[PDB]
């Protein structure tokens, strides 16, 4: 098992001696490495042309949050409120009150990307699969107050992307 890195030692044979001496005086390995970077000059550059091209991702990838509707057009969220109860950063805050119809609903679902750690526990937790960690990954913004999403904001994110998200979940759920 155990292996000796090094430990191997140079021969004192005169051909070898002259070789190492000529190596020192004439810099063989030096020019070797130099030739190596020469060799990497000729390979095709790895850069992608962002924005105009964008890097590969995955169906499972996590990003901006977004509550989302039934196809019926009704919202999914039902305030079982355990999204609050499982987020380690406890970013989420929820305050449900009854619908006039009598159905359970949120009044001010909110979240703040300032504290959220994008761990995707909320994505797992929801029994009705309401909140979803959306594919979008870019929403850097000027002002701190914008980070602190309101419920309406999440819905708008759910409106913007719904075909996309439904596509990911469609492509992914079997592995769940």
């Amino acid at each position: 098992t155990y292996k000796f890195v090094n430990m191997r030692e140079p021969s004192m044979d005169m051909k070898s001696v002259t070789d190492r001496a000529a190596q020192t005086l004439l810099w063989t390995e030096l020019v070797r490495g130099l030739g190596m970077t020469l060799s990497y000059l000729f390979r095709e550059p790895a850069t992608i042309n962002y924005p105009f091209e964008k890097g590969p991702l995955s169906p499972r990838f996590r990003g901006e949050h977004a509550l989302r509707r039934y196809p019926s057009g009704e919202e999914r969220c039902i305030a079982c409120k355990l999204c609050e109860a499982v987020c380690p950063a406890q970013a989420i805050t929820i305050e449900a009150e009854p619908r006039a119809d009598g159905s359970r609903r949120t009044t001010r679902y909110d979240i703040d990307m300032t504290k959220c750690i994008y761990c995707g526990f909320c994505q797992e937790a929801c029994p009705v699969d309401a909140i979803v960690e959306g594919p979008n990954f870019e929403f850097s913004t000027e002002t701190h107050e914008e980070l602190l999403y309101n419920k309406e904001k999440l819905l708008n994110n759910g409106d913007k992307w719904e075909a996309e998200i439904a596509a990911n979940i469609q492509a992914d759920y079997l592995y769940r």
Partner: protein
């Protein structure tokens, strides 16, 4: 009276103008369970907690509202707070009285 107030960095305000409130917690009555009931704990008194002007969050000032500590014996708890030089409100363990039960007493007549 092993006072250690100088050793703790705690500001004088909160070894002074507030009190601990030792008790063995009551059973949640919705529950029929008994487990969480036992073992002394050392809750502090509540102070002010207003509201965030933005987003409506319950912003809060007091340094140590959420603190709470389990114990095995009450004397140990009182002595504990005494070591801290703490004001306290010890409360009795209030075990339910044992009660007679009989399925057949339902069928007296």
């Amino acid at each position: 009276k092993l006072d250690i107030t100088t050793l703790t960095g705690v500001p004088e305000e909160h070894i002074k103008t507030r009190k601990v409130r030792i008790f063995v917690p009551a059973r949640n009555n919705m529950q029929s369970g008994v487990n969480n009931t036992k073992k002394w704990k050392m809750e502090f008194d509540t102070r002010e907690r207003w509201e965030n002007p933005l987003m409506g969050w319950s912003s809060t000032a007091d340094p140590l509202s959420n603190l709470v500590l389990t114990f095995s014996t009450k004397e140990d708890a009182v002595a504990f707070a005494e070591k801290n030089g703490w004001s306290f409100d010890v409360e009795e363990r209030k075990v339910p009285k044992p009660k007679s039960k009989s399925y057949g007493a339902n069928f007296s007549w």
